[PDB]
Each structure stands twice: as C-alpha cells, then as structure tokens.
C-alpha cells in the first residue's frame, strides 16, 4: 500500500533530503539503497538486486538545489529520473510557478509520477512537501495538486507546508503566494501540516541551544515530526494505518484540514545524560505553546480532534493516566460534537541522525490537534495580504505572468470564508 | 530684408557678416516673430564680440521678446559669464522679470551657474524676488538641496 512523496521547490527538496536521510536510518538502508537485513515497502521499492529505492520525486524550476542531491551523499539513492529540474525559477511569483514557467515541465513531472504509480500494487496517495512563500513551492504545487486530483481522483493527498516568517524570508510577496496557493489547493488536499519557520527557528534556538540555526537544523527537526506522522504508514501501524485515516481522525470537515503539530522532547545533543522525561512529562509538554510547529494559542480555541503518536518506551496505562490528568484541565476544551484522544504507540525509540542536534531519548510524542486556534495564523497572513493588495502592490508581477487580477480577490474571499469556518465551529 | 539676415548672422556667430550687414543699414533692433533681437540671439549662443558690436551700435540692452525675456535673462540661463558682465556694464536691468516671474538670478540659480549668480548679486540682484510660484532664488537652492548655491546666496 504504497505512498509517493513529492518534494517541490527549495524548501520541499531540502526538507525531503532530511526526511529520507532519517527514513533510511530508521529502516537500516544505506545511502546506496542496500540493506544489511515488509512495512517500509510502502515508501521504498525494491529492485531485483536488493537495492531499496524511495518512492519519491524531487521537482524544482531551477537546478541548483536538486543538483546538490544529484552529486551528494544520496546521489545513488533516488531514481535519477525522479530528480527533475527546469532552468529558470518562479522568481517568488506564484503566477510563474502555476501558469507560465511551471507549465513547461508539468507534463514531464506527471509522466515520471505515473512511472512510480505504475510500480504500485495498491497506491494510497501522495505526500507533498513545499513552501508557501516561494513561487515554485506555491504555484507549481497548486498546479501539481490540481493535476493529481484529475489523474488520481480516488487517491489521498497530504501536504507538509512551510508557513512564512519575515525573519527568515526571501520575498516581500510571501503572503500573496501563501494565500494564492492555499486557495487553489484547498479543494485538492485532504490534510495539510503547516510548519511556521519562526516557530521551528525558536525551538532550535531555545531547546537545542543553537544561536544561529541553519536550514539543516530546522529541517532535521521537521523530519523528526514528519517521521512521527508517517511512522504508522511505514511500520505495523494500529493508528492512522493508511492515508485515508488521517482525514477520518483529524479532519471532521474537508476545508478545516490544517492540524497543529507539537513535538516533545526536544533536547540538545550536548546533554547526553539528561534525566529521562516521563510519559506524563512529554504529554504535558504537548500542550505548552512553545513546542508547537505553528505560532498560535490553542487555549483561545477549541479542539475538534487530537491524536497522540508515541515513540519508544511507552506503556499504554501510563499514557491513559497522563491523558486522564490533562483532560481535567480547564484550558483544553473540545467542541461538543466530537468524542476524545486517539493514541498510537510505536515501541522503537526515535532514531538519532549522525550530525543531528538532538539527544537520544527513550520516549517521544508527536501530538496532532485540529484546533480552531490555527485560524490565528491564517489571520496574520490575511492582514499582510490586505495591506499590500489595497494598494495593488506587486500585483502587476502576477498579472504579467498569466494570472487574472480577480484571482487575488477570489483567493482572499476563500480565506475570509475559511476564517469564518473556524469561527463557526 | 536685412533684418532677418542680421538675426541669423548674430545667432550663427558670423562676426564678419554682422559688420557688413550693419554697414548696409541693417536694423540692429530687428525682431524675429517671437520678439527676439540680434542681441538676444548673440547673448543666447555665446557670441561675445557680436554682443559687444551690437551694443556699440544702438542695440537696446533691455529689449524684451513676447515672453518678457531680456538678453541678460538668456545669458544668465545659458551661462555665458563674460556676456553677463558686458550686458551689465551697458546697463542691463539686473532684476528684469519675465512672464514666468523669473529674474536673471532665478535662471542662473536653476542652471547652477554659480559664478554668474555671484556677479548678479554684486550688481544688485534682488534676493527677495519671487517667481509666479512664490519662489526666490534662495528658495530654489533650498528646495533642490544645492548647498553651494545657498551659501553664495547667503553671503
């Protein structure tokens, strides 16, 4: 029951580099695909020679980032035909990624995806990694998601998306690109996990004691969260066994499909002898706003679903007790129309990546919550959008690249309705 | 008509043809269709000897064209310092005002002819004279951030 991962633009590719680095280590696969010693078969094909190959595609409209994959440590891991690059990027312009430049390569990308899908006996769907802020990550993702819905109508599609942060940004128009891609992808995505670059940046600073975090620092932390979320798909999973179950468990209504991820513990590798944290302690830390992947205050919101994904030395009764204690807290309010926490346990401890910044721990947890408080993050983007769009600042760049001006207000109205959806629930 | 030929000769800087034309009765104060005289044209295009010759032979140093421009306005605009000096020596009105309200000082200040500005000031140019938007030459130098000009205008 295969899953195909698609990595779009710089952020998607570099996050993909860290995700597959980690996956390989979790499954005992070497950078050349060989394995010394199956559940991982959902994410890796096997050739006739014992070589295990990610079911993964990397796409970018310029070559420099994927060229590093093509020549680096993993130059023999991936299908070389699934590393796809154009020559000229989207210039931080959604319209270039979606309408003009992106259309030069979309058919090639879909034909290479089809090659992977034809290798599958029971394809479940796609995991799509991308930024909001760049032109490829926003516009080409939207185009790809539209095309995949037509070509693979019954297949699930999950996103891992980078929500923009001014302090780590490369374009003024990142709010435009974020709203444009969210508008066109909303109908085509079943579940999307956003990561706020400022939130992860501050976790690296505060918990890993790294004064100036790099993208590699951020991306290895993101990969731990991604791996927790997809562990059920790659191992004997009792919770979230297939992609369909993410919507079942996390998305009560198709549009409100943005769960908040929280991860604990995050401990610097320089503290190799830290006191081991208990199930209760790591579970409590999932409700502290500073461990969240997106900046928002879930105490200002309501929960519609909550999944707790444990990894390591975790006894179920200890989970049930930890949950009993936090259920009592007044600051955790569920909507009336929902049951409730769902729990999965994977009994292997998180894997430590050589070169990583994380200390080995005996237990960890990733909480996925669908909370109305994430609308605060939508409101922050919408406000910056409104300030610029009222003056039509930069709009001519998009209109000159195949987009009609009315798509801006259509996208913003869709966001207004999305915010309303959150208020109503 | 010798008037038109003298206008063209003064514009073109043809000293010899200017003399021949005047020796044959050319109207030294002929005007073209806009009111410009041979002195206006010689002052505009830098022909110092023709300026001098015309002033010695009856040219009106303060003649105005239909826009109110005098020869000194044009010499101050284009930046011909010696001609400015000769015109002033022969009684040019240092504070003549054209239809835009500009004086010679305004035009020399706008065009950055700082040596001419100093000469015009020494000959009594009115630092309080306002153009039709209320600007003095000092206002122009402050509004355009020309510190060198502002310093000259304040001394």
């Amino acid at each position: 029951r295969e899953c195909i991962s698609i990595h779009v633009g710089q952020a998607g590719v570099q996050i993909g580099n860290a995700c597959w680095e980690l996956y390989c280590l979790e499954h005992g696969i070497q950078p050349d695909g060989q394995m010394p010693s199956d559940s991982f078969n959902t994410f890796f094909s096997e050739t006739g020679a014992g070589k295990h190959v990610p079911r993964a595609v990397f796409v970018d409209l310029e070559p420099t980032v994927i060229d590093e994959v093509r020549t680096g440590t993993y130059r023999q891991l991936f299908h070389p035909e699934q590393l796809i690059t154009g020559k000229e990027d989207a210039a931080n312009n959604y319209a270039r990624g979606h309408y003009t430049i992106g259309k030069e390569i979309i058919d090639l990308v879909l034909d290479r995806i089809r090659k992977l899908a034809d290798q599958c006996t029971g394809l479940q769907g796609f995991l799509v990694f991308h930024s909001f802020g760049g032109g490829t990550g926003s516009g080409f993702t939207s185009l790809l998601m539209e095309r995949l819905s037509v070509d693979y109508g019954k297949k699930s599609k999950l996103e891992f998306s980078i929500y923009p942060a001014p302090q780590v940004s490369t374009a003024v128009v990142e709010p435009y690109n974020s709203i444009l891609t969210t508008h066109t992808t909303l109908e085509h995505s079943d579940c999307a996990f956003m990561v706020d670059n400022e939130a992860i940046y501050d976790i690296c600073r505060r918990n890993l004691d790294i004064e100036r975090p790099t993208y590699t620092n951020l991306n290895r932390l993101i990969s731990q969260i991604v791996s927790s979320i997809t562990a059920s798909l790659r191992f004997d999973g009792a919770l979230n066994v297939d992609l369909t179950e993410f919507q079942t468990n996390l998305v009560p209504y198709p549009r409100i499909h943005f769960p908040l991820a929280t991860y604990a513990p995050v401990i610097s590798a320089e503290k190799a002898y830290h006191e081991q944290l208990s199930v209760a302690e790591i579970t409590n830390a999932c409700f502290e706003p500073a461990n969240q992947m997106v900046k928002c205050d879930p105490r200002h919101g309501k929960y519609m679903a909550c999944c707790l994904l444990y990894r390591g030395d975790v006894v179920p009764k200890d989970v049930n007790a930890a949950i009993a204690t936090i259920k009592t807290k007044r600051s955790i309010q569920f909507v009336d129309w929902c049951p409730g926490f769902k729990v999965g346990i994977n009994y292997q401890p998180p894997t430590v990546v050589p070169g990583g910044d994380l200390a080995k721990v005996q237990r960890a947890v990733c909480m996925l919550s669908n909370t109305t408080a994430i609308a605060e993050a939508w409101a922050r983007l919408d406000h910056k959008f409104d300030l610029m769009y009222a003056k039509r600042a930069f709009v001519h760049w998009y209109v000159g690249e195949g987009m009609e001006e009315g798509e801006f207000s259509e996208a913003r109205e869709d966001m207004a309705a999305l915010e309303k959806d959150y208020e109503e629930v | 008509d010798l008037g038109k030929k003298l206008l063209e000769a003064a514009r073109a800087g043809q000293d010899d043809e200017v003399r021949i034309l005047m020796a044959n009765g050319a109207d030294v104060n002929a005007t073209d269709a806009s009111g410009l005289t041979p002195l206006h044209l010689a002052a505009t295009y830098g022909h110092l000897e023709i300026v001098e010759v015309l002033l010695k032979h009856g040219a009106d140093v303060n003649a105005i064209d239909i826009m109110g421009s005098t020869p000194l306005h044009l010499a101050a605009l284009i930046g011909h310092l010696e001609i400015v000096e000769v015109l002033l020596k022969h009684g040019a009105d240092v504070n003549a005002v054209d239809t835009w309200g500009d004086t010679p000082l305004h035009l020399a200040a706008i065009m950055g002819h700082l040596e001419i500005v100093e000469v015009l000031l020494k000959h009594g140019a009115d630092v309080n004279a306002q153009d039709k938007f209320g600007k003095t030459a000092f206002d122009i130098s402050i509004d355009n951030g020309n510190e060198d000009l502002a310093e000259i205008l304040q001394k």
Partner: protein, 428 residues
C-alpha cells in the same frame, strides 16, 4: 544565469570599464582572462558575467558601443582593455555631439542594428539568459539617445528578459553643456516605459560626496567613478556569489518594484573612501551610514520621503546576529519612514567576501519616494531651458518635433506625482 552587459557612450564605457576591473579582481580574473584566485566562491557563479573560452579563459559578456571612436581606444588602453571580445566593440566615427536626437534617430539608428547582431550572438550562446545590464549617462547623446534606442529594441526582441540600467544623471556641478536636462528628460521617459530596474547614479551626489565629505577640492571623473564602481560591485554582489536573497535580476525586481513605473533606485554604500585612502567600521556604523543621506549616490534625502522597499548587503566576516539586530533597529526606530502598507519590506543579505581594500562594507538599495527630488531638479532645469526654446533647433533639425519634448516632460512630472501619491498614502 547569464547577464549580457552593454556600455554605451563615453560615460557608459568609462564606468563600464571600471566595473569590469573591479569585479574581475573580486573573482580572481586577471587582465588576460586567467583565473588566479584563492577561493571556490569566486568561480561558483562566474558564468553570470563571464563566458568561458578556450583553455580556461574567461571573457566578459560585454558589448562596447559608441558613436565616437576615441572611447574604444581608451578602453583598450586600460588594464583590462584587451580582455574584451574584439568583435564586441561596435563603434561609429561621427560622434553624437551631446545630442539625444542624433543618438536616438540619426547616427545612432544607423549603428544600432550592428549592435543588435552582436547582442543576438551573445544571447544565443547563453544557457539561460537572465537579461541585460546597460551602463550609460543620460546627459550626453550616445549613452542617452542611442542607449535608450538600444533598450527599446532589446525589449522588443527579448520581452521576457529583465532590463536593468546604471544611468548617470547630469548635474551642473560636472557639466559639459546646458542641453543635458533635455537629453536626460527625453531618456527618463524611455526608462520609465522600457526598463525593469534603474540605478540612479547622480553626478550631483557623486560631486557632493567628493567635494564635501572626502574633501577633494576639484573632483575628477576618476574620483566620481571610484564611487560608481564601488556601488556597482556592491549592488551586483547578490548576483555574482552564491546566496539566498535577490540572487538574480528578476527576484530582485520582484522584491524591489511594487509598481511597474517606480523602478528607480537610490544606491548607497559605506564606508565612503577616496582613491588611495586607508579601522574597519562596526556593523552599527555600517548600518547607520548606508542609510544616511550623505552616503546616497542619488542627491535625495531619504528622510524627505518613504521607503517602499529596501535591499541591503553586508560584505565581510561579521556577526549575523549583529546584522539582524541593527537592521531591525533602523526600522523600528524609524518606522514612520517605511510604508506600513508594504509589511516586511526590507531584506538583508551577507556575503563573506569583502570588496578590495576593506574588511567590512555595506551597500544599500532603496526604492524611496524621495527620489522624486532628483526628477524634480531635472524637470526644473528642463523647464527653464524649454520655456525659452534654447537650442531646440539642434533637435528638430534631426527630425524631432517639439511635442516629444512636452510628452517627455509630462511623463516625468507624472512620475513625480506618482511618487508623491504613494508617499502620502496610508494603511487606514
């Protein structure tokens, strides 16, 4: 990837030559085309500006244009004069006489097709052409009139590529003639319509810096060009070395140009130095100075207007934490000068490689509404001349009509009014 550089007329070839000297030294290319450099960062993006010829030779992707031959002879006399492709010298014999009409319509038109052939040849050789960089003055005849003719023709043939200019604005403080405001106004009209990004290099500012700040009693063109070349190196750093921000011409434009006509940038840099001069500035000093009116290469005071967008680049080994702290501090302490309706409109890059002779430098690129002061100064000089019809025969005698003058001036005053509109706009 590739940029095609064109340099037109006397000013354009003089500052162009200096540009190629400065960046060749930064990338380790010697006057023969051989790489003698020390670091891998020097070659990583060398193809942006240099073709790689036979036997590890590097040749500027540069086209040299002038209606007067004497300039080409002097370029070839320079240190790097023989590194340029000889077939990329395109020169007439007549000159343009500081007459935009001759550059744009008469002798320039007769030479332009010969230039476009050489442009076409450089462009068809590119893996993925980014666009064009033109160096010229606006106050002459060849750089202004033929330069803008060249721009409109390249724009027609390459409408999908970025057109960037380094345009030297005339000043009475360094002037050959009073027709310079005519030539500049006619050109600005062209730049408003046909370029994507224009660096406003103002001879008024360059003179003021040399005379008053550097205490040079009689500045030479070499003195002015020392400031131009440092500016040109600084504003092209993000294009020539690896990096995340503004790494190509179109990403720069998308970050810097919120409205298509308002693409005229005020450059600035710190430290300001005279040729031969010699303590490295701190990050706080670098930041304060590159935003100071005294360090701008356009003669406009930023504090008289508002910043639409800003790019800054720090060069040298220095604390990234301090760079971010000082960049945040300038915005928060002066928040009223940055338009509130473009949030997060200042972006900063750091490049580890410092320019020649310094350990620490910083370059500012502002899209500020205060640049209207530059256009107003040219307009006032234009209007003073045009009201009296002075020298118009030189233009109409090449075929132009007075209406081209009126339309040029009207378009420039419209530009000014647009700047003031966004200067006064509010978020509400």
């Amino acid at each position: 990837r590739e940029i095609v550089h064109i340099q037109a007329g006397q000013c354009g070839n003089q500052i162009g030559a200096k540009f190629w000297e400065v960046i060749s030294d930064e990338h380790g290319i010697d006057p023969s085309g051989n790489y003698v450099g020390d670091s891998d960062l020097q070659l990583e993006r060398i193809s942006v500006y240099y073709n790689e010829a036979s036997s590890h030779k590097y040749v500027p992707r540069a086209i040299l244009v002038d209606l007067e031959p004497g300039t080409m002879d002097s370029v070839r006399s320079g240190a790097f004069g023989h590194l340029f492709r000889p077939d990329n010298f395109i020169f007439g014999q007549s000159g343009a006489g500081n007459n935009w009409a001759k550059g744009h319509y008469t002798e320039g038109a007769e030479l332009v097709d010969s230039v476009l052939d050489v442009v076409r040849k450089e462009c068809e050789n590119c893996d993925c052409l980014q666009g064009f960089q033109l160096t010229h003055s606006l106050g002459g005849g060849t750089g202004s009139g033929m330069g803008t003719l060249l721009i409109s023709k390249v724009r027609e043939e390459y409408p999908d590529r970025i057109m960037n200019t380094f345009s030297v604005v005339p000043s009475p403080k360094v002037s050959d003639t009073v027709v310079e405001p005519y030539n500049a106004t006619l050109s600005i009209h062209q730049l408003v319509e046909n370029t994507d990004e224009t660096y406003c290099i103002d001879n008024e500012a360059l003179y003021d810096i040399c005379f008053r700040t550097l205490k040079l009693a009689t500045p030479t063109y070499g003195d002015l060009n020392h400031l131009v070349s440092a500016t040109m190196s600084g504003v092209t750093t993000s294009l020539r070395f690896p990096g995340q921000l503004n790494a190509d011409l179109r990403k720069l434009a998308v970050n810097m140009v919120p409205f298509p006509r308002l693409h005229f940038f005020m450059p600035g840099f710190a430290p300001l130095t005279a040729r031969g001069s010699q303590r490295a500035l701190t990050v706080p000093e670098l930041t304060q100075q590159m935003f100071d009116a005294k360090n701008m290469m356009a003669a406009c005071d930023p504090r008289h207007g508002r910043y639409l967008t800003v790019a800054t680049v720090f060069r040298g080994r220095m604390s990234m934490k301090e760079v971010d702290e000082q960049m945040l501090a300038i915005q928060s302490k002066n928040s009223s000068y940055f338009v509130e309706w473009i949030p997060n409109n200042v972006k900063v890059a750091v490049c580890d490689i410092p320019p020649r002779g310094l350990k620490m430098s910083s370059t500012f690129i502002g899209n500020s509404t205060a640049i209207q002061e530059l256009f107003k100064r040219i307009s006032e000089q234009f209007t003073a001349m045009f009201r009296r019809k002075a020298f118009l025969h030189w233009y109409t005698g090449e075929g132009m009509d007075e209406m081209e003058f009126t339309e040029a001036e009207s378009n420039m005053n419209d530009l000014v009014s647009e700047y003031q509109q966004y200067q006064d706009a509010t978020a509400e």
